[PDB]
Design a protein around this nucleic acid. Structure first.
Ligand code: DCP
Ligand code: CA
Lengths: 929, 350, 349
DNA sequence: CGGGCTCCTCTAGACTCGAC
DNA sequence: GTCGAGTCTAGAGGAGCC
């Protein structure tokens, strides 16, 4: 009988899988523990509920090397990261001669021997390096120069665009435009940036070179939170301050001052590589290369001072293997990327000019109120600058017609020469008022556009121009209390404020989505669209003029804040020779198309929870039918012959907290009420905790995620009420409070989770309950006392999720290497893992990912001592097999910039989301070919 | 009815109220437009040409005769599509048999109502069948943006997908006139049926190049009404002001004088300068029946005149001339030397 | 005959070679014009407009329909005079009851031959009888100067004086085509007879201010043929080279050609030249390439002022080969000075 | 007491630098 | 030698992600 049950009647893992994973010899929880669990469940009214059995799964799992799961994972990770630890130790035992006085002015790589002799080499040809790259920002994204430190000799790289002066270089980057490098290890401060300039890193096939980062290890050892970073910077210029002397911000100067504490680091004041041209770099070549070498040496010293501490506080090899695997992200693109950029920019400009037409018309119609001093009668525009400046002052015959024309031209020319009388500096619209002057660009601007083109909804005069009103009251801005409205008099919403002291008026702030403490900075936020539609917020012109402004603001808000990031993404277009034969021979291959890749500049550990941080691709919005350019991730399209096979873990932090609470309570699954509730539920039936919450309260499932994860980590009942009122407008203040008490005072259901989290948090040396990784030195109780409590309690679960990601990466790499699965790691979001696999091995990759999830869940159970795993969370709900990258395999990504969808505008079809029961039938249950 | 009376008073629409029935204007039974109306229509034609033919490497002008002889006598044309399709084989030689390429033409067509005359702009866009829907969507977006970017209320320019009696895909462009939405531009994704009927026999002549593939193009036909478009822009523009687009205003600048002989020569020199620049100027220094400044301002506002240049006694002292815009109603003191650059920049950057 | 073959090949004239004949071209019954011919006629219309309506405060456009309704059962128009005469009353209010004024128009006129459509540039000048012949001579001289401005051999643009049967002074402009002299324009002094016939009685509406007194002006007809003018200029401009005047030539510069980066440079130059108002033939789009002599011959037969070539050396220094249609002298100049050079060359002539 | 991140635009202050 | 136009930094508020 494959079906198994625990003393709590929860369906456990199948008998075959349990025997393959846990073997035998487990210890029973004991009569007392079972009695306590039954008593708790009956007290919370959950012991009598039944459950429908799930089909059993029989798998011939790959042979685990060790005696149990932990030893197996340790062996896998040691095999994966053994050469790179050796390279790091080689760096730890390196002595170099002083940096050469004369840097080589030659294209390519130069090797510096003793005394400073420069020898040209093709590649550094080393196993461990310290790498820094300098890029001329004003010229483009092509690397300018780089200096590398090897244990034997120095290395310096100069580009063809720095030694040779040319009229114009190609703006489409190529592998021939990158730095030629490459079992090798490269160490850098923000090595992700320096990794993106390596020629061989953009190949579709993977490489054995891994990258180590100084910021990531700094965050692992003695990192700081965002609030902690702010406090640290403020102190450099909460009653606990012992954390200051052992922590620093990710700036290389501060990190070197912390871990080394030598002379202060020297920074160039000119910043030529950022605010300079190529000529300045050519003139100051020696100084810039010396600065680069100094930065490389400082990074080397910091790495030497950091690596032993990182190995001490993160002794599990899986941590290092997952940090190395997380730094090889790879996002393929094509000419559709360029077309998407063009279409998004065009749609953004069209909507921008559509809004600016109405804004400029309203402004121009307001200049007439200057005449007759009629602005004193306008409630919206009685406090602007209407003053006007004075200008600064220090049948004729052929012969007759020609003479008349010449005389007129000469008279005009004579009066044309009076330009010397007026001042050289042209005055900016002296005639028009000051508020109108501030909104107009000057003629010297190369991008001058007629009229008040420098206007947007975000400015402080736009609501006054549009005569926006709240419940029949004109909007009023208070610098102390943000926006609001004026009620005539001398209504109770958001309370009055006497600080404005407006004669015969009252000031009430607009309702902010985050409470009375916050201030509204603009009435055009997404939260005010329902109020505009309802009628509380109205425009003076009325009709569709008002709501359309907010609609367009919502549509173009994301692109406005992300066009610089998305357009400046470093894309390197691989030529036909560099592409594999499989891509070329595939029917979908296009001769006239482009095939390149974008390497995300991922900081592996940019969080105190050791999470990753990428400015764009970890902030990339999903496709929506309203936001302009929201199909950003959908433009990451696999090359011909390749598919993006990946999946998302289901209810990660909920399960981690539940298993921790259970293990604290009793060595069984589903002991506490919260653990039992989390396990009892399927995603195909809509009865999981997120779906159950989305049913109980009318908010969406994402809002349910926000609500649950807030309630877990210390959100109060007022926060719950505000969230419910924000994401469901049908609820009133009294009605929303009823549902807040229904899920907060009725919890204890989650008492054991809180007990375990506060036990780990208040420990002198907090450690991850799975891989044993320690918290940052600036968060231990000896340094922070009772402060940063919420951050520390959330750190346990978040770092457990990071350990989950590390385990997933290690297991996936092991399965790919062992069974010869043709694919590579694509990108990992905080709980997602995408792998660029060939079309012929998509189902093998899906089965490998299912096995990886099963192994990771079993590891989480075993490291806590539960000695078993429920069947409910033993496999992925569905593994996505899609050509492009999107949240769901069925969304067609309709956008204001992509109205026809991905199927019509491009050639992207819809993929499939398959469960284990289907993957097994598709691949006969074996990963082998 | 205020718009029609203002058009009559400022010579946009000729005739009395009897001939200015909106049905007559829509049908084309009205008499010809006034000189300002002619200038507005010419500005619309110039902008359409700049957007369609000039900035496209594959769109060429074409000349189709106003009458179609033969099968029983000849007839006057009702569409520009037939004449442009008659030149497909000849114009294949220009682009070296490469697709897509277009033939454009702005002309007058006659349809029964009484014969109503309409100024129409056409674009026959020969495309391979593979991307015919993509090109239809692209041209829909492009023409809709072209109509919207000269409009104070672009929301009144709309689109509507439509199917022909044969099921051929197409789109229709409308403007929200005060009475209702009237069709002003129609894009049809006509197949090769028209080309095959007009060129019976071997299909070797019609073979265009889709990359490296020979194929018979799919006739994407775009037809737009310029008289109704001009009337729509007059309604859109309409203190009584006709806020026509700066690139569509019939009169860019009106020069007036506020020393009779010397100021006459100064204004004459400025007139000749702005004219040679390429800016049409309304002479406001010749009207013997002078009026107050406010009446002149109202008259220039109703005429869609962008700028009123004033040359005064102080101009001879320091070269400063008053300049009032139609938008803010504020004038600015600017030197004579800088007037031509400012006007050119204002027109081009609009 | 060679010129007509070149025009047909180079898309100055549309239709088959058999259809295109001298009589059909002179009668308006030809199949039509090619894109180059359309642009040449458009340049002619623009120059005529600048010469007549522009630079004058007394000349206005005319909007006359193609058909005349009412009893003579409407008919296609035969001239643009009737529309101007019908607009006479309103144009008096337009000029604020001043005098004189004009009503010039360019449009398609229908003449029986078949149906012959000609593009005619007319000029209806309303002047008081005090200064009739003075304005007639002024218009004659200005029109002859305009015709001779673009001519390589302005001696072929003749002018003659002819008297009609009614007994009214008139002039007839001509061009000396190789086969003979053909009428390209004609001036008449018709008088007030047509306006009186079209407005019988109530002469108070027709009164205009000739200074202090009120007079009914006469009618002056200055009617030319822009199609015949286009043919005359083509014949005057004809090594097979069509040396058209820069203000009339349809295409100014031909741009030709690492395919990708050269294409990008050519696209940037093309965009700049188009934005600055210079028509460019995009010859760089053609993957197929022939001898540079063939390209030069093609661009010469298309009346293209200059041929610009972007090569590999351009990326390094920015220099581009430039070939002149008139002088056949090649030179190297920086690609950033081409726009200003072309603008200066056009403005010079 | 939600947590951990990302970056933008706008406004104010400080500063400087040139023009008269 | 005073003062207005750039310049730069910073802080706030908004908005993407998990
Ligand atoms: N507002 C949020 C959103 C997310 N997370 C954390 C908790 C999750 O464990 C992790 C992954 O994000 P998801 O939203 O994907 O969480 P789930 O994986 O549980 O979502 P689902 O399982 O429904 O796909 O991010 C959080 O703490 N707070
Ligand atoms: Ca998940």
């Amino acid at each position: 009988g494959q079906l198994r049950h625990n003393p709590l009647d929860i369906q456990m893992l199948s008998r075959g899988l349990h025997e393959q994973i846990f073997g035998q010899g487990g210890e029973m929880p004991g009569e007392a523990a079972v009695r306590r669990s039954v008593e708790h469940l009956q007290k919370h009214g959950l012991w009598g509920q039944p459950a429908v059995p799930l089909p059993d799964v029989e798998l011939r799992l790959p042979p685990l090397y060790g005696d149990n799961l932990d030893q197996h994972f340790r062996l896998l990770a040691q095999k994966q990261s053994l050469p790179y630890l050796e390279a790091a130790n080689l760096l730890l035992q390196a002595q170099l001669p002083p940096k050469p006085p004369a840097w080589a002015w030659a294209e390519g790589w130069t090797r510096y021997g003793p005394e400073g002799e420069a020898v040209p080499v093709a590649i550094p040809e080393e196993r461990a390096l310290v790498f820094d790259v300098e890029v001329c920002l004003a010229e483009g994204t092509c690397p300018t120069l780089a200096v590398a430190i090897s244990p034997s000799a120095w290395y310096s790289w100069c580009s063809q665009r720095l030694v040779e002066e040319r009229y114009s270089w190609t703006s489409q980057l190529s592998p021939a435009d990158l730095i030629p490098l490459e079992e090798q290890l490269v160490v850098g401060h923000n090595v992700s940036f320096d990794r993106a300039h390596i020629r061989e890193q953009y190949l579709i096939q993977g490489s054995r070179m891994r990258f180590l980062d100084t910021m990531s290890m700094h965050m692992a050892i003695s990192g700081l939170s965002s609030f902690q970073r702010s406090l640290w910077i403020a102190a450099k210029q909460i009653s606990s301050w012992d954390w200051l002397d052992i922590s620093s911000v990710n700036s290389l100067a501060e990190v070197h001052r912390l871990y080394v504490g030598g002379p202060p680091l020297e920074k160039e004041p000119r910043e030529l590589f950022v605010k300079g041209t190529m000529k300045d770099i050519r003139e100051n070549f020696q100084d810039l290369m010396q600065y680069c070498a100094q930065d490389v040496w400082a990074t080397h010293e910091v790495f030497q001072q950091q690596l032993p501490l990182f190995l001490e506080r993160c002794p599990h090899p899986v941590t290092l293997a997952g940090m190395l695997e997380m730094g090889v992200s790879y996002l393929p693109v094509n000419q559709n990327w360029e077309r998407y950029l063009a279409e998004a920019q065009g749609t953004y400009e069209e909507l921008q000019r559509e809004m600016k037409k109405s804004l400029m018309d309203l402004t121009n119609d307001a200049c007439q109120l200057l005449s007759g001093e009629r602005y004193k009668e306008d409630p919206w525009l009685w406090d602007l600058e209407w003053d006007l400046q004075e200008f600064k002052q220090k049948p004729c015959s052929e012969e007759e017609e020609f003479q008349q024309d010449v005389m007129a031209r000469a008279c005009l020319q004579k009066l044309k020469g009076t330009t010397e009388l007026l001042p050289k500096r042209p005055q900016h619209l002296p005639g028009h008022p000051g508020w109108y002057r501030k909104l107009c660009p000057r003629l010297d601007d190369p991008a001058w556009t007629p009229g008040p083109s420098l206007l947007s909804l975000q400015m402080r005069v736009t609501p006054k121009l549009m005569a926006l009103t709240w419940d029949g009251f004109p909007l009023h801005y208070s610098e102390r209390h943000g926006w609001g409205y004026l009620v005539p008099g001398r209504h109770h919403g958001n309370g009055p404020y006497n600080d404005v002291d407006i004669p015969g008026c009252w000031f009430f702030k607009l309702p902010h989505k985050d409470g009375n403490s916050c201030n509204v900075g603009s009435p055009f936020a997404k939260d005010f669209l329902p109020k505009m539609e309802d009628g509380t917020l109205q425009a003076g012109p009325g009709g569709a003029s008002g709501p359309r402004a907010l609609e367009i603001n919502k549509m173009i808000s994301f692109w406005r804040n992300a066009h610089k990031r998305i357009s400046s993404q470093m894309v390197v277009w691989l030529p036909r020779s560099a592409l594999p034969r499989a891509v070329i021979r595939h029917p979908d291959y296009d001769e006239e198309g482009l095939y390149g890749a974008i390497l995300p500049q991922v900081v592996t550990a940019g969080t105190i929870t050791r999470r990753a941080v990428e400015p764009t691709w970890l902030t990339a919005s999903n496709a929506r039918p309203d936001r302009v350019g929201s199909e950003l991730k959908a433009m990451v399209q696999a090359p011909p012959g390749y598919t993006l096979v990946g999946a998302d873990v289901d209810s990660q932090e909920l399960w981690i907290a539940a298993v921790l609470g259970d293990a604290h309570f009793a060595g069984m699954h589903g002991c506490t009420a919260f653990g039992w509730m989390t396990l009892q539920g399927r995603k195909s039936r809509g009865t999981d905790l997120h779906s159950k919450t989305a049913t109980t309260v009318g908010i969406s499932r994402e809002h349910a995620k926000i609500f649950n994860y807030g309630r877990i980590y210390g959100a109060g009942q007022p926060f719950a009420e505000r969230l419910l009122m924000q994401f469901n407008h049908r609820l009133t203040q009294q009605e929303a409070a009823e549902k807040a008490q229904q899920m907060y005072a009725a919890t204890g259901t989650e008492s054991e989770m809180f007990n375990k989290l506060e036990s780990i948090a208040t420990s002198d040396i907090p450690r991850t309950p799975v891989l044993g990784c320690c918290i940052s030195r600036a968060l231990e109780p000896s340094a922070v006392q009772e402060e940063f409590m919420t951050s520390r309690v959330n750190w346990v679960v978040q770092s457990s999720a990071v350990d989950y990601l590390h385990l997933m990466l290690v297991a996936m790499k092991w399965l790919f290497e062992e069974f010869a699965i043709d694919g590579r790691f694509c990108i990992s979001i905080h709980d997602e893992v995408r792998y660029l696999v060939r079309e012929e091995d998509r189902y093998r990759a899906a089965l490998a990912l299912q096995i990886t999830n099963l192994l990771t869940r079993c590891m989480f159970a075993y490291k806590l001592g539960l000695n078993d795993l429920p069947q409910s969370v033993a496999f992925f709900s569905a593994v996505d097999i899609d050509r492009c990258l999107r949240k769901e395999v069925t969304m067609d990504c309709k956008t204001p910039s992509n109205p026809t969808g991905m199927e019509r505008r491009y050639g992207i079809p819809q993929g499939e989301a398959l469960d284990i029961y289907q993957i097994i039938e598709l691949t006969k249950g074996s990963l082998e070919k | 009815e205020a718009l029609l009376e203002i058009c009559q008073r400022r010579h946009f629409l000729s005739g009395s109220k009897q001939q200015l029935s909106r049905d007559s204007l829509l049908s084309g039974c009205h008499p010809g437009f006034g000189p300002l109306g002619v200038e507005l229509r010419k500005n619309l034609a110039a902008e359409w040409w700049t957007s369609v033919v000039v900035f496209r490497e594959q769109v060429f002008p074409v000349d189709a005769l106003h009458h179609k002889p033969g099968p029983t006598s000849g007839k006057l044309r009702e569409n520009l599509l037939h004449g442009a399709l008659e030149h497909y084989v000849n114009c294949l030689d220009l682009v070296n048999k490469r697709l897509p390429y277009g033939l454009a033409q702005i002309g007058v067509c006659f349809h029964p109502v009484s014969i109503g005359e309409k100024t129409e702009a056409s674009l026959v866009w020969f495309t391979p069948p593979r991307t015919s829907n993509q090109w239809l969507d692209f041209w829909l977006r492009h023409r809709l943006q072209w109509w919207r970017k000269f409009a104070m209320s672009p929301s009144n320019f709309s689109s509507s997908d439509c199917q022909d009696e044969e099921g051929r895909k197409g789109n229709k462009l409308y403007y929200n006139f005060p009475w209702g939405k009237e069709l002003i531009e129609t894009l049809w994704n006509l197949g090769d049926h028209e080309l095959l009927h007009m060129y019976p026999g071997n299909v070797s002549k019609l073979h265009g190049r889709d990359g490296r593939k020979n194929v018979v193009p799919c006739v994407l036909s775009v037809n737009g009404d310029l008289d109704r478009g001009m009337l729509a822009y007059l309604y859109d523009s309409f203190r009584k002001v006709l806020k026509l687009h700066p690139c569509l205003a019939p009169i860019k600048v009106a020069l007036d004088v506020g020393p009779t002989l010397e100021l006459r020569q100064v204004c004459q020199g400025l007139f000749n300068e702005l004219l040679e620049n390429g800016i049409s100027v309304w002479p406001g220094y010749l009207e013997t029946m002078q009026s107050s400044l406010e009446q002149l301002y109202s008259k220039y506002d109703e005429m869609s005149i962008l700028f009123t240049v004033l040359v005064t006694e102080t101009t001879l002292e320091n070269g400063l001339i008053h300049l009032r815009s139609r938008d803010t109603t504020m004038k600015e003191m600017m030197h004579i030397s800088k007037l031509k650059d400012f006007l050119i920049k204002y027109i081009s950057s609009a």
